[PDB]
Amino acid sequence: QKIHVGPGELDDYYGFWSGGHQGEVRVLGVPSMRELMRIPVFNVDSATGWGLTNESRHIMGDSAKFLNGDCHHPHISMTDGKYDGKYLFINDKANSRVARIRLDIMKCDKMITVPNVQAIHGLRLQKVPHTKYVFANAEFIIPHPNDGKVFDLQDENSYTMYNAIDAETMEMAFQVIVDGNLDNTDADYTGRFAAATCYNSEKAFDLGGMMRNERDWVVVFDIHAVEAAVKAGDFITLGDSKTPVLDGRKKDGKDSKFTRYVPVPKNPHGCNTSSDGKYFIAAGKLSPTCSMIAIDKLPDLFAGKLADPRDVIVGEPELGLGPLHTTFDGRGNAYTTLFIDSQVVKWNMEEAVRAYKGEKVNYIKQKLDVHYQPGHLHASLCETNEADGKWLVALSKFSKDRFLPVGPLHPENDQLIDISGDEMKLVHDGPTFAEPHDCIMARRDQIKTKKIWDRNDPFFAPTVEMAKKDGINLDTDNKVIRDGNKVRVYMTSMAPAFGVQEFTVKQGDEVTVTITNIDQIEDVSHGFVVVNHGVSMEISPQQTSSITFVADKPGLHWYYCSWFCHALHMEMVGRMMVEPA
Amino acid sequence: QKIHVGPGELDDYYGFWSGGHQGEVRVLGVPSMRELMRIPVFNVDSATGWGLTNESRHIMGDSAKFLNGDCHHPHISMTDGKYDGKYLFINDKANSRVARIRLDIMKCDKMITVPNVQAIHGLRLQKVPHTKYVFANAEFIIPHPNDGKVFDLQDENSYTMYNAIDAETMEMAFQVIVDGNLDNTDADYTGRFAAATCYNSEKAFDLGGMMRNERDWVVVFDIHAVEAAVKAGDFITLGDSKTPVLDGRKKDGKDSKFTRYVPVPKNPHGCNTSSDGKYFIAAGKLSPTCSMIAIDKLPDLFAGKLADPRDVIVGEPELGLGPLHTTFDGRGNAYTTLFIDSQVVKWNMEEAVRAYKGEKVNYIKQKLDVHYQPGHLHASLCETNEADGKWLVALSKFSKDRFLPVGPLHPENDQLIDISGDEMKLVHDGPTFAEPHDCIMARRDQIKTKKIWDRNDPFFAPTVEMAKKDGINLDTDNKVIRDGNKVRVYMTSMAPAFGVQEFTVKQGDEVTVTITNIDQIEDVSHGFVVVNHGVSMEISPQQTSSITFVADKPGLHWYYCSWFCHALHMEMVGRMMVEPA
Numbered sequence A, B: 001q002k003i004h005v006g007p008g009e010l011d012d013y014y015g016f017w018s019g020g021h022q023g024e025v026r027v028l029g030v031p032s033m034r035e036l037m038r039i040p041v042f043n044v045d046s047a048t049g050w051g052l053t054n055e056s057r058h059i060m061g062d063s064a065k066f067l068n069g070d071c072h073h074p075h076i077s078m079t080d081g082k083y084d085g086k087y088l089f090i091n092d093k094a095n096s097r098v099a100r101i102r103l104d105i106m107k108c109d110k111m112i113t114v115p116n117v118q119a120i121h122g123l124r125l126q127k128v129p130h131t132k133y134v135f136a137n138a139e140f141i142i143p144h145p146n147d148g149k150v151f152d153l154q155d156e157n158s159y160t161m162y163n164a165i166d167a168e169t170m171e172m173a174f175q176v177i178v179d180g181n182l183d184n185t186d187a188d189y190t191g192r193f194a195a196a197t198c199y200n201s202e203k204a205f206d207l208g209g210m211m212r213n214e215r216d217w218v219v220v221f222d223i224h225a226v227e228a229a230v231k232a233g234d235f236i237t238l239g240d241s242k243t244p245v246l247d248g249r250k251k252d253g254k255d256s257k258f259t260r261y262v263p264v265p266k267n268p269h270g271c272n273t274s275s276d277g278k279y280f281i282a283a284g285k286l287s288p289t290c291s292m293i294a295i296d297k298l299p300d301l302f303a304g305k306l307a308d309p310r311d312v313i314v315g316e317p318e319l320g321l322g323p324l325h326t327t328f329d330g331r332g333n334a335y336t337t338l339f340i341d342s343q344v345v346k347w348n349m350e351e352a353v354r355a356y357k358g359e360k361v362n363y364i365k366q367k368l369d370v371h372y373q374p375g376h377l378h379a380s381l382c383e384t385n386e387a388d389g390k391w392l393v394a395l396s397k398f399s400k401d402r403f404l405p406v407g408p409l410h411p412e413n414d415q416l417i418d419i420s421g422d423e424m425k426l427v428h429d430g431p432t433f434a435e436p437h438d439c440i441m442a443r444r445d446q447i448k449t450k451k452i453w454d455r456n457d458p459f460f461a462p463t464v465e466m467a468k469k470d471g472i473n474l475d476t477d478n479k480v481i482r483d484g485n486k487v488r489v490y491m492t493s494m495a496p497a498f499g500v501q502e503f504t505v506k507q508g509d510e511v512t513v514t515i516t517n518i519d520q521i522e523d524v525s526h527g528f529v530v531v532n533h534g535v536s537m538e539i540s541p542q543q544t545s546s547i548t549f550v551a552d553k554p555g556l557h558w559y560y561c562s563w564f565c566h567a568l569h570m571e572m573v574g575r576m577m578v579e580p581a
């Protein structure tokens, strides 16, 4: 199988890599593992102006004031348990957000700060009949209200919440209060259930405290019941947020309609749905096991036809030290990372289930050593009923001597493994910055991208409406509008010339520059940088982009095109003249 | 030779790629072309906290207020015309800066904003006896003073300057006022001469004007002459800058001792010294030629022993449409990018010099098609007398369909070419983000890096000194100190625990957290993120890092370690308790 992609050949799959603590999404080609694009999300990108432009800051909202993020879990929207290539969603653990990327344009187009929570970590998407909800965990227990009067984690009103976000509007759909906490989450192949791991059933703040119980749990959600109750008006609201909040905690040993708690050892981490839709599989972490929940049995467990939530457990195979995550080949095998043993282990799921019933059968097929300390792993199409069993990527946290030395900070090592046959074979070591946690792969044919921008694109639609209010036709016009101490420059750009090559303002004026790139050849991107003003943005063919800054320095100040666009690139410049105060 | 670096195998060279309009520097392994590390410079990095930490912000100075940069030209310090592996230097065109990276820790340790200029573009280093100076072009003509009274470029006080920076102290050494402008720059193999291309001899602000003259020039600097005048005290100063300024403009047709202007067609761009030290080679851009300046004729030219400046031109090879840059195989051949024709042309310098004198000889050896529109190019060790003729990288601006489609914004195509034989061979297409402009290669054995930090390292020495005055021992102390509205938290860290796991403050307190990673195992980095406060940073083994923020929200606020560091990483957390105002 494959591995090398020569000059002029194309990769077979797209890979969407989390940027981890660096805050972007990275687009790679697979199997070459080459990075094709960076999509700024929670990071400020000097190149495109993400975090500086008026269009980006509108999307970010009030959260545009943060210069950091911490992303882990990239996921592609689904239709009937297959990728539809519409959206990618990702979490921000640092500043508690979820963002949506439009895959047609490879840009973040929506962002939300989840209300009344701390630390968005686990994230996954409804699969069936389609991604109606984005599911996301808030990891940390906090007081409600968090007003500084109570700090105790055991308080009646100290808890965390499971979050559902409407995938299309990117507005909150509902929140569910839970016992313990939340780590990772996955969804079924019907749309009725979702599940999450919990490592802090103790509601402790100290290490020993958090490891006290032999068992924490997987919490299972009946979204049907949730939706039913929201429809009926049977919910509370918290603070000034209008989001429906349901109580999924236990009361005096009795369940809520919304949740069931399945005991699982021990500070479990991964929560993974098998490609056949049979199981939620929780990785044991401190327990050298995985726990297999039979989704089949969940209706009976919510109907109470079951005397014990442990009865939904149909497998608990011992695999090795520190199991963290599980993926699938669609051939009946599961692949689990063993952080401590530094291996990926291949195991047979139906054999594991028979072994749980006492049968003497070896469900373990192979252990591949990886380099070093694997976290997540991802098999091609593993989140869909189309799991194709071809490629596997294991994402390891300590690269040691696997790459040239680069100082005290090392890359992560994302290792590509061919799983197409009977024996797993390590084929590529991929260094990556700032710790991608997870990644997702999609077939080439699953992603359709725009070659050039549409003038009606929603990404800059508000800017078009601003322009129309000034009587500006963006496709043709070069004009300076004055409004008190505001100056709005509108210009077309066509290599190698800006449409407005000079303009004069007064010291202290707030200047908005709006640029529409009217080159129609694909790939002729323009840039716009104002020297010594901290101003920088990209304008691609048929895009409009705007940026606003104060002209607080008198004199001549040059601006230039940053994207090499024409033989006369260097000469694509202009002059802002600032009259003394 | 080579090409594929399999798992467990190591690359043969380091590549340092400029990060372009993105602002960082990128470390690659060559020939695999995989990215090993990102080093933040002008960008704000969420992962390591560059632009957020006190250490980084002190390095940036007043410029820390900018979130962007635009870099082009990375260069490694030299001893005796060979790479010494001490420092890498890079420009910022956006906000007029030069940065120094220490190659032992792979971090930016110094930064300067060049005074009284706009837009630092061309940058190269002194070769012999070693890198005493960093040479840097200010591209854009401005008024002096630039106070808004005059905007005219033709004003006798409107000009740009050539800049020299002390490589060791990173303070300005001198500036030289020039006629016209400055684009790219190189230095000879003795320390006496430097050279730069000019495209705006016209002092124009528009395309018509900038393209008028059949010829602009290469300006040549007699650095010895300049240094003499600084030593003599024969210089002026501009504004509040104490930097010695020398006047290298012709007056009434008369030459200064500092400069000579050599007419060259037309808007020339590349300015490259051959690895045998014989020629300054200017790429003709709008002329389909390069111009070769014999460096051994330069003493005569400054001595007044030559009839006209054109007497130093010893070759003017006709290469093809849009020649931009030139590199060297150390075997007597040059390689030039042709932007319009979209090719790299291999040519013999000796034979081109003979053809200029009349001889009939085809100096052109081969033209290789590249994909597409090449900007810079770089052969292994080309900036040194050790040019080894193994690898060539051509960095093309338009990748078209050479990679999977990723929307309207395309990657650059940095193509790896085997030049070890007589025939150039394309072996690899490397996609890159944000337009690297140039790159530089060095042998594995030319770079030596730290495995772990030294506690005495100058990078965070000021923080250590500050901590002492507070009566703190960073190596052991886990402590909170208070003064009015300020709170200084000092802690050690060892996987999987912060040394301080809780602290309480009053709403509105300015909090500085200083963390010392006391692990001694390589690769065991920690992170520190305060949820919902825009606070993020890296602390590597034996590093101290600090960061400051306001506690402007009452309640409980979690902080956590972002760097996956242990099986118990998820549990490396702590609590900031903020009492209501």
Ligand code: CUA
Binding pocket: A495, A496, A497, A525, A526, A527, A561, A562, A563, A564, A565, A566, A568, A569, A570, A572
């Ligand atoms: Cu427009 Cu370069």
Ligand code: CUA
Binding pocket: B495, B496, B497, B525, B526, B527, B561, B562, B563, B564, B565, B566, B568, B569, B570, B572
């Ligand atoms: Cu310290 Cu993860």
Ligand SMILES: [Ca+2]
Binding pocket: A199, A200, A201, A202, A210, A211, A212, A213, A215, A216, A266, A267
């Ligand atoms: Ca626990």
Ligand SMILES: [Ca+2]
Binding pocket: B199, B200, B201, B202, B209, B210, B211, B212, B213, B215, B216, B266, B267
């Ligand atoms: Ca000119």
Ligand SMILES: [Cl-]
Binding pocket: A184, A185, A269, A270, A271, A272, A325
């Ligand atoms: Cl998971």
Ligand SMILES: [Cl-]
Binding pocket: B184, B185, B269, B270, B271, B272, B325
């Ligand atoms: Cl050059």
Ligand SMILES: [K+]
Binding pocket: A397, A398, A399, A410, A411, A412, A435, B564
């Ligand atoms: K790591």
Ligand SMILES: [K+]
Binding pocket: A564, B397, B398, B399, B410, B411, B412, B435
């Ligand atoms: K490009």
